[PDB]
Amino acid sequence: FPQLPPAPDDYPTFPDTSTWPVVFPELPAAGPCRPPQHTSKAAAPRIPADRLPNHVAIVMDGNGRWATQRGLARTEGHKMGEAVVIDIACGAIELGIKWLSLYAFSTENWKRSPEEVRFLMGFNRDVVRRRRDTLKKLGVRIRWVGSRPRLWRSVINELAVAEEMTKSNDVITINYCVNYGGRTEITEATREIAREVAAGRLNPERITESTIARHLQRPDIPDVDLFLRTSGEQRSSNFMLWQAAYAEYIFQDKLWPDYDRRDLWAACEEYASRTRR
Amino acid sequence: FPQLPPAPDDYPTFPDTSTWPVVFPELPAAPGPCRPPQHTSKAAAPRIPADRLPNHVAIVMDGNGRWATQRGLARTEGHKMGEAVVIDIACGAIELGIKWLSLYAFSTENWKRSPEEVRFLMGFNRDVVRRRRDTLKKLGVRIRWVGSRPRLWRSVINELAVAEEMTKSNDVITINYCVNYGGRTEITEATREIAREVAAGRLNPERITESTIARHLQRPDIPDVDLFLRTSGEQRSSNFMLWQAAYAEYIFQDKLWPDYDRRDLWAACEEYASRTRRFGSA
Ligand SMILES: O=P(O)(O)C(O)(c1cccc(-c2cccc(-c3ccccc3)c2)c1)P(=O)(O)O
């Protein structure tokens, strides 16, 4: 039962949405720190290890519907979404999930207005810079997954720093997927394979499903167990395409800025129920 | 509105599942493909405009063994009942105007079942194709196999290869009958072919694009899946049409495959046609 037990009543909480960016609380010093509990003070459900998803992937959908209901720009929905990412990371640690893949920026987003794309590049750069120390302290290992063309060098470089600083952590790994597309990533694995073949380092007849797996950008990513998408949308949208071929999908109706760790836990309790059915 | 109109009231119905194999009725001549028999309920396809219909539906046929188990029957009986369901779905797809239909008959994962289950399923798929190939031809269905050659029985490939040759000029609907199919495997096989072309100095690695992978899949004419359906409450894509379904809409239906009929296909298609299409979606 790999859950952290309920925090003491007085242990720090997260998120305090009275400031933007939300200020992550000081924690008592431990190794990694125990993450703050949710503001509701709910505790993670008891799910046995062999029924827990090892790897959860999340498409964080609904930020513009959320902002539209409030007469705000979509960028306000993105802003509120930053604290939900952190809260979900805290929740995932409390529950004992080991891998979390987050679809921060699809290759499809290049169709959005250039002003919004520029905001999202800047914003993802800033989130990583602003949260890198908090992630390090909680024992998160983070790194970039995605494709290089068009992506701002500053975002790649900022994740590269957070990956270097968190390389030894092992409480949870977050794949922070930026300019990511599943077909694109498989096509890059195939290009790599092709380079190795043009070079005579690899025999085409030896190519198997493992060869593709070994040549993906991050070959250490395990299969996705549980694939989640918010806002009621029931598509995988090319996210973790290779890795989620055998995933279970749980499509939830809440909009991402309204989501919190208790919703992640409820999807994980459902996933654990289906290990029986 | 590319639906066929409601059929005449005395137009032949299908399926009558009181006998096995199920009888497919004689149909009046055309000129041209025959109009499919209407469902036993005589329901007519809903009027969904062409711009809101899926061009390509993929279906995993789930729950055959669970269905037979609930009735205390051998699991082979659920499979046998799913044959008429495949044909009924093909007739309802034609009535609705669907142009592409992919059916997941046997997965690369299925070699993990017992030898007796595998022999049964390989032999039963061979037999379905033989039994139904003339009927599909008469309905203007273009049918062909999609899947991986290693392990797959040569008798299955042979029956599908003749069905493919018999129906190659048909154009009412294409059915990809997917047997020993695994999406990662089909991508690996495309990557092998690309690698062969590179080793032969015919393709340069820096000219490889997503299109190159698409052009080297086994059947490169298959369009993207617009609507991906599971039955029996399964909520996974199980490696089916993995490259082609990357942007599909998923609907996970509860009904077991042997209980399924063309009205369930139409209802999933009505649900798909109603979904709001969000920013940037094809
Ligand atoms: O997924 P988002 O909520 O960011 C989205 O749905 C979105 C982004 C920005 C604005 C909206 C939007 C625009 C116009 C109307 C509405 C709407 C909201 C609630 C009820 C009816 C319409 C929502 C919707 P998108 O996938 O189309 O980009």
Q: What is the DSSP string of B1-20?
A: --PPPPP-TTSPEE--TTSS
Residue the block writes with tokens 């239906």: B253
Assigned architecture for domain B12-275: 3-Layer(aba) Sandwich (3.40)
Q: Helices in chain B by DSSP H: which ranges?
A: 64-70, 75-96, 115-138, 154-167, 183-199, 210-216, 262-274
Q: How far is CA B115 from CA B76, B110, B177, in A?
A: 14, 10, 22
Residue B143's closest CA among B172, B120, B186? Answer: B172
Q: How was this structure determined?
A: X-ray
Enter the tokens of residue A241. 């395409």
DSSP assignment letter at B200: T
Partner residues linked to B146 by β-bridges: B178
Distance CA A43, CA A32 (A): 19
Dihedral pair phi/psi, residue A251, rounded to 5°: -95, 120
CB neighbourhood size of A118 (10 A):
12
Closest by alpha carbon to B248, among B221, B277, B211? B277
User: How many degrees, rounded to 5, is the angle at CA B47 between CA B43 and CA B49?
Assistant: 155
Question: What's phi and psi for B221, nearest 5 deg?
Answer: -75, -5
Contact A221, A175 (CB under 8 A): yes
Alpha-carbon distance B233 to A207, whole Å? Answer: 35
Judge if the upstream peptide bond of residue B21 is cis by omega within 30 degrees of 0. Answer: yes
Neighbour-count burial for A192-204, b at 16+ CB within 10 Å, e otherwise: bbbbbbbeeebeb
Q: Is A218 helix (H, G, I), strand (E, B) or coil?
A: coil
CB A275 within 8 A of CB B263: no
Write phi, then psi, for B60 (nearest 5 degrees).
Answer: -100, 130
Atom number of ligand 1 nearest to Cα A77: 4
Residues with Cβ within 8 Å of residue A130, at least 6 apart in sequence: A21
Amino acid at A90: C
Which are the contacts of B153, defined by CB distance < 8 A and separation ≥ 6? B122, B123, B126
Provide the edge-to-edge strand list for the sheet that holds A248-251. A140-145, A172-180, A99-106, A55-59, A226-229, A248-251
Going by C-alpha positions, the residue among A246, A277, A252, A258 that lies closest to residue A55 is: A246
According to the 3-state scheme, what is the secondary structure of A261-275?
A: HHHHHHHHHHHHHHC
Candidate from A68, A109, A230, A256 with most ligand 1 atoms within 8 A of CB, to mutate: A68
Write phi, then psi, for A99 (nearest 5 degrees).
Answer: -135, 135
Which residue in A197, A245, A247 is closest to B195 by CB distance?
Answer: A197
Resolution (A): 1.8
A243 touches chain B (CB under 8 A): no
- Any alpha helices (H) in chain A, and if so which ranges? 63-69, 74-95, 114-137, 153-166, 182-198, 209-215, 261-274
d(CA A151, CA A144): 12
Mark out the alpha helices in B97-230 (DSSP H runs).
Answer: 115-138, 154-167, 183-199, 210-216
What tokens were used for A83? 């604290």
CATH classification (class only), A12-274 = alpha beta
Other C-beta atoms closer than 10 Å to the C-beta of B215 total 12
Q: Are B61 and B89 in contact (CB under 8 A)?
A: no
Establish whether the linkage from the previous residue to B220 is cis, with ω within 30° of 0.
Answer: no
Residue pair B246/A243 in contact (Cβ under 8 Å)? The answer is no
Query: Which amino acid is residue A105, in one-letter code?
Result: F
**Number of C-beta neighbours around residue A112 at 10 A:** 18
Q: Does A184 touch chain B (CB under 8 A)?
A: yes
Mark whether A61 is an active-site residue.
yes
If one residue of A61, A65, A110 were mutated to test the ligand 1 pocket, choosing by the most ligand atoms within 8 A of its CB, it would be: A65
Cβ-proximal residues to B247 (8 Å cutoff; 6+ apart), any chain = A235, A237, A238, B224, B281, B282
